Amino acid sequence: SGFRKMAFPSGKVEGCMVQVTCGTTTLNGLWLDDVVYCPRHVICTSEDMLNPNYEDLLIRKSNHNFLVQAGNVQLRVIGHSMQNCVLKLKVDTANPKTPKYKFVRIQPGQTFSVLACYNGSPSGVYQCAMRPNFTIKGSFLNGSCGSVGFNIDYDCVSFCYMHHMELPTGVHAGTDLEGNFYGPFVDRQTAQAAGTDTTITVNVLAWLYAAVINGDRWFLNRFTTTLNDFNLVAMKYNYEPLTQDHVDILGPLSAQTGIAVLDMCASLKELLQNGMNGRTILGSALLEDEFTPFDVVAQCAAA
Amino acid sequence: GFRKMAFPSGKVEGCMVQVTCGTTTLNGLWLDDVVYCPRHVICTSEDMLNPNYEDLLIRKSNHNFLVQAGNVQLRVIGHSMQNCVLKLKVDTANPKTPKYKFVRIQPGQTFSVLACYNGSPSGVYQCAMRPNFTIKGSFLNGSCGSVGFNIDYDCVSFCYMHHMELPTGVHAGTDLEGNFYGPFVDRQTAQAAGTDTTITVNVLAWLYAAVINGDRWFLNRFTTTLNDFNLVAMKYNYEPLTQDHVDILGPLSAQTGIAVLDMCASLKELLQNGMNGRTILGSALLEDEFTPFDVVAQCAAA
């Protein structure tokens, strides 16, 4: 028993991390099948980042301006291409350690494991969620750009995130591996507004089911509610609206526990209105929204 | 920002095997032609109520230990019991053996757990050895033989092997020489963990981490002494702070310009007044699962 914020094992992704240098700037790249993916801002100086014209900056570069290192070993770049905000560096040798992989664009509220890297070297692994405002609350210091986020379904690594930017507020922004930003953000050093963050309601409910499964049951109350009634309370506390899709996703957890989804929503409502009154749930004094329903099931089933 | 961060698990992934003996299956650690696993792999459910491990091990031969590493079967050519671990000598050295050590850690130290089922990696998370020598992990039925480790760099220091869930739902285990952390035994019986306490030095480190990240509301106008603070500490079931702990916080004191005893005065006020519904680094309670080395490392980017 017990319940932990757990990352996927990182070994498959460790073998894909390289260093990418271009003039002054050094950061991380992802080496799969003779292509190296990294943030296009590797071509920028500090001054460039204030207002980059990426086409004009990339024109001053050739293949030989991109230094790609894996351990001690240099890779020869034989091709460079810009796809949205990622650079694709075609190299002469396929990564012998390429895993089975996909590129996925995830939805707000989905979770993934980050492997935080500096100079192409793994530092650490942690789990986080794409927030409803398309930011993440990671841990990323100055050389961490090009660090990747991923899920493993089994054997296959689904890469969903590449780190690009820290906002002035100290939250993080980045792309999928086709180089499209999650959210409204751009790879420019300017004031950029993250919108209102909201809590991922379906995840909170999943985590409450996780609590019940692990014996934490005090918050099960005597009430029920409707979907509209609950969502009325949800909007007041900046919780995401719960839909029938979300009720369907919670079904297995409902079945395992014998606690109906709308009964669990009634419990959540009371916690919203009354707080936790100095108690904890799974050792947390706040409501956790970083577990999906699939994460809870997986952890409890032992995927 | 600031996150509970595990070590990358790749080096340890290549050491995980499945060990089967009669009915029971669990995880083992393959280094240099030896497989380490929990000796309770030889037990049935009935045996676990009152095991005589010597007498149970006598009924076993090398061929009764099925060791699988991925698809590859390993031939066992030797078995021995060291404390509560079984050492299975196999015919092949693990080609993926990393540089490694076996370390017995102190209460309050942290490590990364790679949770494994049937010799396969499930997931990685960071936790702390509690002052009462338990941990609050995530461990389901086949998780025994899962390991805890630190990486200093290139070298993997194995500190923990999972053996037991207690009736209270906390976890217990050994070092890699098979000695239990704490008073526990590998027997399905009522076993008392003592009073758990908070790891004071870790809380202070995490407050320094907070200040570094811009969370500063809890900085107050007081100072205190070591004995005065420890008087408050014992009331709240916090570990006593010593000069060793003050010395280890020195670099964080230097970085922030907040003297250690000034930070202890802040903590005292949080202890006495609670948090008044506020948060620090996104936690509404005091976090004791980061060491001083962990905070520095995360902030420096090792």
TrEMBL record, chain A:
Localization per Swiss-Prot or TrEMBL: Host cytoplasm, Host perinuclear region; Host membrane
Protein name per the record: ORF1a polyprotein
UniProt gene name: ORF1ab
Organism, as annotated: Severe acute respiratory syndrome coronavirus 2
Family statement: Belongs to the coronaviruses polyprotein 1ab family.
Top-level taxon of origin: Viruses
Lineage: Viruses, Riboviria, Orthornavirae, Pisuviricota, Pisoniviricetes
Portion of the full-length sequence here: 3264 to 3563 of 4405
